[PDB]
Every structure is written in C-alpha cells, then in structure tokens.
C-alpha cells in the first residue's frame, strides 16, 4: 500500500492507491482503501486488508452511536482515539494497521490523526503510510506548500501516489482522491495508473527513466 | 491474509 | 424460599429513615461514654469502661481506645467485636497508603474510607450494620490536630470537642459550656475527666473504670507522640485534677 | 450475592422504596441553585442545632466534580459521597477517551443513570439523595443547572431548590425569578439566592453556604463575612 | 439448591438489642459451670464433666482442650459449637501465625482470632451466633500468663479470675473473696476446686472434674531431646489421680 | 411479601399489572401512522414553570429510520433506548442494511420480562416505536412491560389515553395525509391535557422515508398549533 | 507436532453477467499426491438465490458453509422471512470469517447471486474476511493460472482497439451466459493441464431471477 | 497435541450394486513392534452400519464407547427405535464428523481415520470418510493409510465412477477387497495376515466375517533371486 | 391460598397453585385448533386484537421446515419456548443430519417447563402450545401445557371456549382423520372446528390464521388474503 493525507490552506487532501498483495501475487487492483465514516470523516487503510476493513467499519458504527447519544457529531480526536484505544487492547496479538483519521469539525478545524496497530496516535499536517510511503514522501515533501491551490493540492496528492505506484512493487492499480472541507468530504474520482502514468509522463515531461 |  | 426470613436490613421507613441504622444508634446510646477534645497543642481521648468487676485484669486491657497508626487513634462506643473488624481494616488501609505514596495517610482520608465501608452496609448486601461509633483523634501536616466521629450510617463530621455513647446530651452541653478555642492539652485533659465525672451513671469516677490517651507534639521538635495511659498514670491524673 | 428485589411495584403502580427515598431528601437540609446571565450560584442551608463543629475539616456541601462543574445535594450525606466519587471518576475517564471535559448535561445524565440503576437492581436500595449539578460546558459561557432525584429523572432548571421547606423557597423563586431577565450579574444572582434561603433558614449566620461558578473553571466559595454582608443588606431593605 | 441465605439472621431490634446474641448468652447461662484462675506462676481452668448417661465414657469427651502447647481452652454452653471452634482455633494458630513467624501466637492474638470467627457468626449471612462462652488460659514469652473470656458477640476480656455458665454469679463472688495477686499456682488449683464444689450436685471427684493448667515447661512431655531451646508444653491436663490427691487435703 | 415473578389467581403477573398502573399515571403520548409518514407527539408536563421545558426529552431517535416516544416512569426508558440504538447499529454492521422496525421492537420487548430473583422489576414505561422500512412501510408499535407489542394505525398512551383512543378511533382513516395527522395529534393532545396546549408543553415529531426521523422545533409546532385553531374556528 | 490444517486442493471461479452470475468449481478433492474423491462438490445453493464456495482446507470450508446456511435460516426467523440480499450475505460472512481472526478458516471464499437491482454479483473473501465485489474472481490452487486469463477475457485488460495506436481501450461489456460458460470451461481445462490438484470434473451453478441451475462437465482424470 | 501409540493400519472399502463392503486387519502395532493380534477395528452399529477405524487404538476404543452410548440414547423414549427412528449410517457419520472437527478445533484430536459404511433405510449405499482433521469425503471406493495408495487404484479398476456401481456384484467386489488385502500384506510393514470383513447389503443385511486370512500368495520366484547384482550362487 | 406464594410449595391436597394459575392464562387466551390426517397436520388460530386500530397478534410460529406450533396465553413465553425448539431442531440437523422427531420435541418441551415448576425464584410458563409436524413416522399433533404435560392427539383445541371445538372434533374424528392427500379439505374441517368456539364474532380475513405441514408441504403459514379462500 501507499496512502497519504495532508493539511493545507484549503482543507485536507486524501489520496490512496488500490493494490492488495499476498507476497508477490497481486490479489486485487481495485481495493477501496478510503472508508467514508460520515460526511465529515474519512479513514485510510494500510496493512492487513481484513484488519483495516473490519475495524474501520466497526469504527463507523461507534461514531454513529456517539451522535445518537450525544446529539452531536464525534470529534476527529475522539474518533481516532476510539480506534487507537481499540488496537492498543489487541497489542501483541498481531493486528497490522496503519491508518489516518481525517476530518473537519467546527471545534477542531481540519484535522488528521495517524493511528497504527502498535498503538501510536499522532496529530499532524502530513503523513504517508504503507510500503510505498517513502516514495510518496519524496515527491510530496519537495513540492508541498501550505498555500497550494485546491487544484494543485489535488494534483500533488495524485502525483505522489503515482510516484509510489511506479517505484513500489506493492503499490498500484489506481489512485482514489478526496478533498475535505468545512462542508465535508468531496470525492475527486478513481484514476487508473494504466492511463494516468502515460498522461502524466506526456503532459509533465517527467519519468524519463522510462522507455517512452 | 493479504495486505495493502 | 428463604425470602420468608429476610429482615431487609437496608430499606427505608415511610419517613425515609434507615431502621437498622436508627436501632444501631439506639444500641450505641447505652455504651460507655467516650469523649474527644481538641486543643491547639494536642488532643485528648477519654472513655468510660462498661461497668467493671473487681476481678477484671485492667492493665492488660483495651476496650475503648485503639491505635490505628503512629499519628491516629480511635475511641470506640458500641460493640467491641464489630469495632475490631473495622480497626484492622483501617490499620491495613493506612499501610496501603504509606506503601503507595511513602507518606503517612491524611486523617480525613482514613476516616472517609471507614465511613464509606459503613455506608455500604446500609445500602447493599442485606447484612446488619456495624453497631459502632468512633471518635478519631489524629495529626497530619495538612490540618494538624483533628477530631472526627463516624456512626453506623457512615456519616462523619469534624469536631473541636465531642462525645459518643451514653449521655452525650448532658456531656455535649457541658463541653459547650467550658470549651474554649485557645485551650491547652492539660486543660482539655481536665475538661474531659470533669465531664465524665458529672455524666457517669456510676457513683464516682475511679482509675479502674477509665481509658485515656493523648496525642501531643510533646515529644521532641515538630513530631508527634501517642500516649495511651497506664492505670497508674490515670490514677495520678485523677488526683492531679482533684476528682479523687 | 444478596439478590432481593427491594424496589418493586405496589398495586397502585408506585415504587415505595423510591418514594421513601424522596422522603429522605425532604428531611435533608435545603439546597438551592439559581443561574444568572453568566454564572450559576449554589446555596445550601446548614442546620444549626450544632455548635462545637469544626468547619475547616467538616465536609462542605458543594462538591467539585471536575474543575468546571459542581454538585450539591439534599438527603442522606453518606449516600451522596458514593455518587460524587463515581461522578468524579467518570469526569476523568471522559477526558481520557474523548480528550474533552464533560458537558454538564452529560455528567448529570451519568449521575442520573447511576441513581436509576439502583431502582431496578437486586440487593440494593435507591439513593436517598437529589442533586443540583451546575457549571459551564468546555469553551461555552451559557450557564447550566440540572436537578436529579432518586428515581433517575433529571432536567434543566432556570432555578431550583430541594430539601426541607423547598416548596416555600420554590414558591419564592417562582414569583421572584424572571425567565426574560435573569440576575444579570454575580452580585445580583448571589443576592436572589440568599433571599430565597432566608425565607426558610433562621439567621443568615453560620447557616448559609454560597458557591459561585463562572465560566472557564472559575469556581469560588464565599466565606462568612462575604455572605453575612448579603444578609445584612437585605434586612435593611426589608423595613419598608 | 445452594445457600440462598445471604442476609443476616442477627439484626438490631428497636430497643437496640441483638436478639440472637442475647439468646446465645441465655444458652450459655444454661450451660455447666466452668472457671479460670490466674496465679503468679500459672493459670488453672476447670469444669464439671457432667455425663449424659453413665454408660458414656466421659474421658472420650474432653471439655478442656489444648490449642497450642502454651494455650488451653474451656467453655460453657453448647458442646458441639465449642468442638468446631477448637478445630478452627487450632488451625488459625498455624495458618495465620506459625506458618508466617515460625512460632506459636501469643495468647491475646489467638484469642483475637477466635473472637473474629465468633463475631463473623454474628453478622455473616445465613448463620446463627455460637452458643458458647470460652475461657482461654495461656502463656507467651513477652506477656507471661493470661486468662481471657470470649462471648458469643465476639467480645473478649482479660480476667484475674472468673466463671461462666450455671452458677457463675455465686462462683464469681466466691472468687472475689479468695483471689489475691500473690497466689502460687497450687493455691489457685485449690481455690478452683473449692469454687467448683458449690455448683456441682452429684459426685465430686477426679472422674467428674476436668481441670488443666498453664504452668512450667514440661520437657518430659516434649517427645524428643537435642534442641536445648525447645523446652516443652506449658499446658498440662491434670490426671484423674492428681485431682483426687488434692481433694483429700481440701 | 411474595415473589416478584408470581402469578395472580386470574393468571396474570402481579408486577407486570402494577407497572401498567404506573404507566396510566404517565404524561400522554400519541402516534399516528399514515402512508406519507408516522407522527409522534407527547405532553411534556413540566412540574413547575421554572423547569426549562426543552430539557424534557420524551421523544427520542433510535436510528435514522426509527423514532420513539415514551410514557410512565421515563427514567426506566434510558436503557431500553440504549439497547434499541445498539441493536439497530449492530444490525447494520452485521448486515450492511437497515434493521426492520418490527425486529427492533421485538428486540426491545425481549428485555421486558428479564426480571426476577437480570433486573429486579419490570419497566414502568410504555413505548411508542415508529419507523419505516422497505418491506412493511410506515409502522407504529406499542411496546409494553409485559413483553407484548402491537402494531397500530394510531395509538395513545398515558393518563389521557382512554379518552384519546376513542377519539383516534373516530378520526383515523387509511388516507390521512401527514399534515392532517400532525394536526390531529395536536388536537387530541389539547383535549386530554390539563393545562392549555402550546409549543412549550407539547412536542411533535415524524419519520418519513425521505428525511428520516426529525423532532420538530417549537417555531414549526407553534405554527401547526395556530393552523389548528383556525381550522376549528372556521366551522 | 499436530498441524490442525490441511490442503484439499481444487479451484473455484466466479463470473457475473448483467442478469446472471455463475460460481464454478472442480469436483476433485486431494491430500498430498493422493485423490480422495473425483466428485465431491464444493459449490452450494445456500437459499435466497445465493451460491457459495469456500475453497482450501475442506473441513474449514464445510464448517463455514454450514454456518452461513444456518445464518440464512435465522435471518428468516428473526426478520419476518425477509430475503437476505447478496450485499448483506457478504457482510455477514465477513463477521463469520473475522470472528476466527486468530485461528482462521483456511479458505478462499466466493459467493455469487443477484444484487437488489437484479444485476449479477460476485463477492470474494480472503481467509480472515476482507471482501470486495467484482465481475470476476478465481480462487484456490489454480487461481494464479486462471485469474490473469479472466482479467484479459472478462475485463478486456491490455486489449486495445486495432489501429487506434494503443490509445483507445477495448470497450467494457457484459457477456452472455453462453460466452461465460465457454470461458469457465476453457479456464478449467487449461488449469487441469498445468495443475496437478485440478481435474476430474467441473460443476457450474448458474444464478438468475428464476433460481439456481446446475451444469456438469468431465475433466481430465490424470 | 497428541502422538499415536498403539495403531491400526489401513481400512479399505467400496460400494457395489446392492450395498457396501469394508475390511481391516486385526493388528494393533506399537511402533515397529506388532504388539497385539486380536484387535477388531470394524465396529457394527445396529444392523445397517459398520464403522472402520485406523490410527490410535485408545482413541478407537473411546469412539466405540461413544457409538454404543449413542445407540442407548436413541432408544430412550423412542417406540420406533428399531424401525423408522433407528440410527441411520448418515446420522452416525455426521455425529462422528462433528466430534472429529471439534476435537481438532480444540487442538486435541482423536488420532484416527474413519470410514462409515452402511445402507440407508431407503436402500441407498452410504460410504463416507472422516479423519483427525475433520476432513470428510465420499467416493465409490475409500481407503485409509497405505490402503489409499495401494487399494484404491485396484478397487477403482472395478468401480471407477458412479455408473460402475450397478454393474458390480458382491462376488466381484469382495474379490477386489480380498485381493487388495493381500497386496497390503505384501507391501505394508505394519499389516497382518488376519483381518475382518463386513458386507452391508440392502437385502441380506449385515454379514460380519471374522478371522479371514490372506491366501494364494506368490513367493516362489524368491528362490531365483540371488545377490543384489553380480553375485551368481 | 396460603400455598400459592410460589411454585416450590405443594398445597395440603397435593396441588401446585402457581402452575394452576399459569394454566389460567391459557384459558383467557384466544382459541386455537389443531387436527391432522395421515398425510397432513393443520393449525387454525383465531387472532385477537387490542382494538380496531391495532394488529391481530400472531399465534403461529415456524420451528423448522417440518415443524411449528400455535400459542394460547402469554406470547413472550411462546417466543422463548419456540426459540428453544428452533435450536433443538437445528442441533439435530447440524450434528446428526437428522430432522427432529415431533415426539422428541414434545419430550424436550415437557422437561424444559418442568424445571420451572420445582425450583425457587423461577415461575411456570404461562402459555399452551399446539405442535404439528411431519417426520419419519408421519403427521403429528401435540398439546403442550406449562404443567409440563405433553400429549399426542388426532385433534384438539385450547384457549377460551375451546370446549366447543374439542367436542366437535371428538364427533368428527372418523371423518377428518381420513382426509388424506387433500390439504384444503383438512383445513376446511379445522376452520369449522374453530367456529364452534366463536361467540358474537365470526372469522374475518385479518382475524384467521392457518398453518399446514405434511408429506410434500413444508410448514407454511397463511394470513390475510391467503385465507379468504376459507371464510
Ligand atoms: Mg508498483
Ligand atoms: Mg490436472
């Protein structure tokens, strides 16, 4: 996997690939690694496919119960801490998760929490997570500015996943893109690397290592 | 179990 | 089933009283009077024994005054056996605190936990309450000298001077009359004994029908000493204040 | 375990053990809560058949549950300690998991839930306590005042009183409290609270406690003279 | 099935009495007289072996029991209740003391443990109080000789001398006349034998009287030699013969 | 005394029958089922004018497609609601769908007789459970502490119930619009209520397939109240 | 040391059309280099127009299928005879599998039927309950041989429009049931040629709005 | 977590036109020691089922007791116990299969491979296998251990598919089974010469033959084999 | 009187009054009828409503493909007992691959009910059940009472005024017992039996409830327009 999420001027960008592997066997190229918890909350998946999928849809149920009981949408901090306190109970049992809980609330503003299965929970503006995280970081970090336009931010996120999809053998398939604002999350499409790579190579003039 |  | 024989020890009367607590208090009202008086430089505990026989071994005896730790003691009015159960609990609780924090337990904290135990017997479990009221006398470096009482309800309150057991009505009136804030320990010793002397149901107060303790700073410099009086020491303090 | 169903229904549909717990509240010393425009005030009667009391160490009647919420009560004193401890633990646990202190409504709902649980569990009697819970939600300046009772029902009050002669002082507040214009300041609100207590209390001597709670964890207990001043000032406006 | 009696059977009445403790004391009142006297170099405890049938062999029924090598007990009230208390008392001397400190408990502390057991029968669910009062005579290095009375409530008191049961009121009066702080153990045995005749109806000999002492160490009763710091049990039951020897010089 | 689980000679459970008396003392709650939605309305019954009436919560969301109104010992309903919400959300987790209204109601009703010498007494509160699902459409259920539940086209519970039920008997027909049903709940409430009905001492709610369960604000309810007087005056 | 798992071989394959879906599997059952049976079915009609196969360790496969069939039974009992939709079955099966996360069912699970709009659906699961809907999935021993063939022939991967300079992809389109059965039969004969654990027989369950039909074909027995 | 001690080798079986045959030798081995020789490894249940067991004998004896208790339990409050509510082979199998899989799931298996052979009440032949892992399967021929390797290929020459069953008489099928038992005695180092055989026929019922022996063995050619390559005398 | 405080107390004439009071809730229950031939078994139940705005309480519950029951009395108690039956039928399938004998279902219910008539704190079940099914020995009808007594019958009825139907079935026996291979005729006879227990009311379309099980019919329930055929 490769997943990222970064904060900027215009909210949060979330971008992920769609590959699942069992060793070198490519098991799927069409995994939905972003889970839509509520209209203002997103979770990203990396690590064990089942672990991530199961506990992150379980997380959605817990967030729903919060708002029934408290007549109010759950904070990103509280939602992320439910997941991190859950996995911490299982510490040592061999759960494998690297997740980011991404969302907006009025009390918090746009917020990202990195949560993994060792029980680490970190608030931050930029994270990349998965086997391809370093590749994504390399592109993302060297073009990141707080002031990126929504247009540029979306592309950088998309381009960073592409970078990782290309170099990391265990990332690929397609890029899924989200933008999160004060009004909630907005989906910005599924982008097959099959066509996206060649489109980016041509239009951007990058990827000269590759036989054109 | 496959991974991501 | 067995429901037939259940007295229901933890219910309310139609007036909203706890029968068993009330009846336990009634039991305590026939117990030997115990008095606590708090001075600026120490505390007195004085208590009257339930009417002696001449053949009772009076020096190796303890019925009223118990040591909880080095800085805290209690005076008992009620069932002795019930009180010992609670006393060992309190002693252990003091040691847990010391072990945990490396500091002697603050007096109130000890008093609260004992009172919380009593409270439990009035709300759940279907058991009879403990037929005991305590006067707690102790020192800690937050509040200094403190007197408290607890009773079978598990309610506790703090005092400058207080009595428990028999004739507390007469005793409380007398303490109220003669007590004053700037009092020294040796004055409080006298007040305690004079109060028992007048409220006693016996003909006259003698050394062999008493237990007595002080908690002073009267060791050496900024540290505290418990003195549980020997019989001969009470006999002397009874002469020294002219009751015999 | 001791199992007996002590709180049960009677033929008329009443739960006598809950209703008798209310009688224990009725016998308790009076407590009143009044919320201003920007503060909440908690006033408590202390029965004056007691001198030789040590007030330094005697359990005060208003308890901080967290640094922004206070709870007072009328009824059995020993019972109230149990509810306060549970409430205090929950306050810390809420901070630990939600990373936010409790709302006053949440904390009230919790205490209320505990009280209700004790009305349909075997081997236990209900709490002989009703509570007034007051404070300000985190990052909020709108004052909150709630009341709970042995049955478990809870609700919000512009002002409310519980304990003995509470009907006399509820009577007072009902004609003296304007929903439209709540005591616009601390000074104003403390006064109305003391007035209502003077309907029932005796001397305003060592008989009245007042605790004021303002927003952002600003809680302070008034001491004798500060209260005494209020008492003095009302009787001097009384001869008219 | 199982014990659904988890509530107290002893509760306060409106006057404040605990009925079952009072009634247990009444059962002790009915009981045969027993007594204890404390001398300067010993303690004596004695009672009447009032037999149920003369076909019964009353040596097989011991009313005076060894608890530790330096502690003994006698009772008045219900015999079966006493028997299980002795069983429990012996065991608690080991589990809560000897197995911890490698030595036997001092008298007051063993007494304290028995009292705890009896207090629990006064408050725990589904039980009645014990229908007995005990007299426990004992010796330990730092307290010397001591005598305690334990009642159904769990209360205990130290005595110079006392008596319990049937003719206790009379016997306590007798003991006030005779007791002084200079009694040598033989004098205490003698007084105990005089006091006990007042309350015994029928035969009065070493086969109807049970009597034990806490006195000197008995190396001959130890069972082994070679550890010079182990000197033997201070508890000794007087034989049928030993008692009759003291009844001729009565 | 006598066991909590005892039968009367008529073959009824004393404790269940006595809890039904407690429910008669409760404030009135009314529900009406239409083909356009289900309305739920209740009498708030503030015990004193100082008590802030919006804090009285006798209508409650269970899930987006299910709502609840209560009458009787309302504190007893907290755990029933909690169970209902968990049951609904859990079902969606296990099956990726909305839980049926009847299944929800049956789940809540399973709690009811779990008392004895489990809880110490039956619940002292009746529930009106209203929702929508794709199979059986709009539904209204009356859930009692006996563990029994009945589907209704319309139903009243609480003190004013026998009067209000007779009224609902006359007024309900299979073609009521939602707006007709809202007015009708308001009308029947004003009839059986002690004090004079206004937007502060009564509350309305509905559940529609399209927008799910909504509690009406006081501004919206006040206008339906005004619309109701003008309908009655005008003939 | 006792090893609680075994491997019974075989392979399965699910394809979904516009108004139908198929779930096929070979009927051979093996351990090591021995044949246990040449006809032991592992694709099952589970009711409510759902077919299911759980291929790998047969004992685990049978246990799971049994549990799901039972789950369908109770779904009727508890929810007024309501039809269990394929999406709801899938989610239920995730919980069945993940419930044994720390002692897994060693199976690759596939279910097939119709979604709520009457369109053909195939869902596949990893051994601990990760799942996903697809047009297409092979599972079990020969999965790695068959799956890339299906990417090419069902989803037209790496196939372009002739003379468009590799710029216009072959356009996606649903297959007829006749075409799908051809791909299934060829998939299995190819798999039989090159995988020793695949052979003997092929059983196909086809699911349409009129129910579940079966077709059987002989496969090479070596 | 177990290891088998006293063990039984192959159990072999097949369907024929009217019923099923099943056989197994009477040996209980103890490693390479052929320790016990009078061991019956075919256990009949009613008059319609035989359960043949290989693997750990202590676990086999446990299973015997379960089956004999099952018969008892089925008779309880059952007036049709010897008629419509008699135990079927499919009931007995599923019960065993359930137990085997539960025991493997508790990491404490019954160290056996089991073949349940019989005839259902409607006359259908029942032949199904289950082992320590709870793995189950049906085939016209079934065998365990070396039997799977050496008997199956021989028995499948007779019944190679479903349609071959009607064409197979009980004489033909018993011949194949008895021949297969000889081969196993030639080639399995933990087989014995003595064995039992049972036929469950839908007409004649259960025939249980004890104390069979492998006969007509070819050993004569052994005399012509000298040395291991170049040696002559 | 002094002996009806709980189930664990016998009266001086050897009666169990709590069990008898449980039996009484059955008597207040709406009527339901069971009857069978050799090929099928039928349940008919009169459903009762709260008022004209309410549903008509279901009285028939499916237990398996070959078994099910009707209830009279406390409905939650039928839910508990029917759920137990579902499990027992289920256990028989998963473990033995065997459809549970209706007779065993009977014995299992008897033993479940009995436990609640001998132990303190519990209470007897307050519902009567009529169990029908088709198994390896044909069609069956059982009558369950919460005393624990279960009885196999050709036909019967329980609830208020069930004595009308039970008399009718007693005369009709020789006829209905031999309605083989004809579902609709057996049902007709059942509907007529229940009609002998009606007073001031007759069978409407959302009032009648029928179930049938037999040789080649899974236990199925008919309500609403599906029963109009029979009125
Ligand atoms: Mg790659
Ligand atoms: Mg092959």
mmCIF file of C-alpha atoms in Angstrom, chain H residues 11 22-26 38-54 56-57 59-68 71 89 92-93 96 112-118 196-198 200 206-210:
data_model
loop_
_atom_site.group_PDB
_atom_site.id
_atom_site.type_symbol
_atom_site.label_atom_id
_atom_site.label_comp_id
_atom_site.label_asym_id
_atom_site.label_seq_id
_atom_site.Cartn_x
_atom_site.Cartn_y
_atom_site.Cartn_z
ATOM 1 C CA UNK H 11 -9.207 -49.606 6.373
ATOM 2 C CA UNK H 22 -15.455 -52.745 4.257
ATOM 3 C CA UNK H 23 -12.383 -54.529 5.635
ATOM 4 C CA UNK H 24 -9.493 -54.014 8.061
ATOM 5 C CA UNK H 25 -6.799 -56.242 9.594
ATOM 6 C CA UNK H 26 -6.743 -57.310 13.242
ATOM 7 C CA UNK H 38 -6.858 -59.916 18.228
ATOM 8 C CA UNK H 39 -7.917 -56.318 17.593
ATOM 9 C CA UNK H 40 -11.302 -55.760 15.943
ATOM 10 C CA UNK H 41 -11.238 -52.461 14.028
ATOM 11 C CA UNK H 42 -14.677 -52.781 12.387
ATOM 12 C CA UNK H 43 -17.486 -51.786 14.745
ATOM 13 C CA UNK H 44 -21.074 -52.505 13.676
ATOM 14 C CA UNK H 45 -23.786 -50.088 14.809
ATOM 15 C CA UNK H 46 -27.270 -51.566 14.562
ATOM 16 C CA UNK H 47 -27.704 -53.904 11.585
ATOM 17 C CA UNK H 48 -27.182 -51.268 8.874
ATOM 18 C CA UNK H 49 -23.797 -49.634 9.604
ATOM 19 C CA UNK H 50 -20.161 -50.625 10.106
ATOM 20 C CA UNK H 51 -17.571 -48.090 11.261
ATOM 21 C CA UNK H 52 -13.980 -48.995 10.336
ATOM 22 C CA UNK H 53 -11.205 -47.160 12.179
ATOM 23 C CA UNK H 54 -7.451 -46.729 11.709
ATOM 24 C CA UNK H 56 -4.658 -44.631 17.612
ATOM 25 C CA UNK H 57 -6.376 -47.623 19.252
ATOM 26 C CA UNK H 59 -8.993 -43.264 20.676
ATOM 27 C CA UNK H 60 -10.724 -46.037 18.683
ATOM 28 C CA UNK H 61 -11.886 -47.621 21.956
ATOM 29 C CA UNK H 62 -13.152 -44.214 23.078
ATOM 30 C CA UNK H 63 -15.131 -43.945 19.815
ATOM 31 C CA UNK H 64 -16.552 -47.463 20.327
ATOM 32 C CA UNK H 65 -17.929 -46.301 23.667
ATOM 33 C CA UNK H 66 -19.457 -43.173 22.088
ATOM 34 C CA UNK H 67 -21.240 -45.264 19.444
ATOM 35 C CA UNK H 68 -22.532 -47.803 21.974
ATOM 36 C CA UNK H 71 -27.461 -46.495 20.436
ATOM 37 C CA UNK H 89 -25.460 -44.512 8.729
ATOM 38 C CA UNK H 92 -23.777 -41.954 12.861
ATOM 39 C CA UNK H 93 -21.338 -40.386 10.399
ATOM 40 C CA UNK H 96 -18.575 -38.620 14.363
ATOM 41 C CA UNK H 112 -7.907 -41.639 13.678
ATOM 42 C CA UNK H 113 -9.086 -42.017 10.118
ATOM 43 C CA UNK H 114 -12.639 -43.347 9.965
ATOM 44 C CA UNK H 115 -14.803 -44.865 7.241
ATOM 45 C CA UNK H 116 -18.527 -45.211 7.893
ATOM 46 C CA UNK H 117 -20.039 -47.868 5.637
ATOM 47 C CA UNK H 118 -23.706 -48.837 5.508
ATOM 48 C CA UNK H 196 -12.168 -58.902 9.293
ATOM 49 C CA UNK H 197 -14.602 -58.068 6.503
ATOM 50 C CA UNK H 198 -18.193 -56.836 6.587
ATOM 51 C CA UNK H 200 -23.943 -54.422 4.420
ATOM 52 C CA UNK H 206 -25.186 -57.181 7.715
ATOM 53 C CA UNK H 207 -22.753 -60.071 7.232
ATOM 54 C CA UNK H 208 -19.719 -59.785 9.517
ATOM 55 C CA UNK H 209 -16.856 -62.189 8.742
ATOM 56 C CA UNK H 210 -14.114 -62.635 11.357
#
